[model samples]
Target chain A: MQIFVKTLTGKTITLEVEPSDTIENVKAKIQDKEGIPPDQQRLIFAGKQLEDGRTLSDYNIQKESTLHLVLRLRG
Target chain B: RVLKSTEMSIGGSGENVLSVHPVLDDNSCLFHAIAYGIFKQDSVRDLREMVSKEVLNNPVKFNDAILDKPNKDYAQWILKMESWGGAIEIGIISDALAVAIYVVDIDAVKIEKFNEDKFDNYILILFNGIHYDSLTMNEFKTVFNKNQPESDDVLTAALQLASNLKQTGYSF
Candidate 1:
């Protein structure tokens, strides 16, 4: 299955993964490419906060799904 | 950078003035702070000309004029520079006039008294070089703009604009 994600910088990346891949794994990949600081990172799905350490399966994420990755900073 | 070692002009006169490197003191920082406004606004060249020719009373004797009159009309200042072969005649309001005074080189500037009609109008102080200029109530209105940048707000709308740009993968 394919997953589509968009970052705050508006860069889109597509990844091919299975149900076994955790959200944490996807987050690491996004961080690698975007350089978003971990603390300021937030993941929102269906207009709500995504629980930490949860897998894509936990939120019923499936093929051809889209998620918005917001970047933030303090001070 | 005055890179010239010994540049000179020619005339029928046999006498020539020995030019020396301009000296700047701690007070110079204040003028620089004022000039920073032009730089922040990306109007450095514009400001340089404005300061040299238009805003100043006498480009040759700028020190005497500004020190003599803290409340000179902005139009008169522009006219003074025009008499010395300057372009870009601009009519400035209180804020712009205040910044122009701030940008005046310290050695070339002399403030007799702090005036409200001048300093207080600068709404956004990009640079506040340490000059003896006082901020009267009238002057504050220029920089503070009466409203918008509320006294209680910590983050300004300008900063928010910067954040918006960064969120879109931009840097300044």
Candidate 2:
């Protein structure tokens, strides 16, 4: 499926993927597309924090499904 | 784009002088400046509501990569008010209404055009590093519809107006 990232430029950012991919892979995917740095990439979906090597299937997420990646390195 | 460079009659010359439309300098001011320029709507309450809807309607489109906060929280925060909105607000409004927004940043000392050349309706505003203010020709002409042809002149007029302000020491 495909996902649209409501990025700041005001235009949307979409990516291709499957439910089997890990959160890390997804983050890397977007980083390639938007120059996203690692520190601020707080990958979140379906109310569960995206940490470790959890797969999208862990949270039932897939492209066409909603994805949220909040950016803030501050504590 | 100041793509032309110029010299002359300014074309739409008349009672129209460069009018800098003023809006409230509160947390919710940018929308006020733009609503007056494009929507001609006086309610920031309504504008914020509509923006909230736009932000939520497409979750991925407004994710944190684009917002400093979570899209869900940011969408809600816009309605309540905070620091202020910028391109995200500018693009959403311009995209929704199909109006080209030209922002003359008093501090940037330049005309920053958003959604330019993509549509017929045009609106201009001026902003210092601190506040966003609306721009018009003596407050006489605010919305510039390209289909009218006369607007081609205000293009120069507005640019000239910014240069005038820049001279008065109104920049960052």
Superposed Cα deviation of residue B105, candidate 1 (Å): 37
Clashing pairs in 2: A5-A13, A5-B60, A6-B60, A6-B61, A6-B62, A7-B66, A8-B66, B17-B138, B19-B138, B107-B172
DockQ of each: 0.01, 0.07
Q: What is the C-alpha RMSD of each candidate to the true structure, in Å?
A: 23.5, 9.1
* Cα-lDDT of candidate 1: 0.36
List model 1 lDDT by residue over B48-149, tens digit each.
445444345443222232222332443354333223111121112223455322111122121111122334333222111122111211112213332333
- Model 2, B25-135: lDDT tens digits are 787778888888876666677777777898888876675655656878878887886636676677678777888877765433445556665777888877665577787
RMSD of 2: 9.1
- CA shift of B132, model 1, Å: 29
Off by over 4 Å in 1: B1-172
lDDT of 2 by residue, A1-75 (tens): 787654333445688988788888888887777555444366656555677588878877754876665543110
| Index of the highest-TM-score prediction | 2
Docking class of 2: incorrect
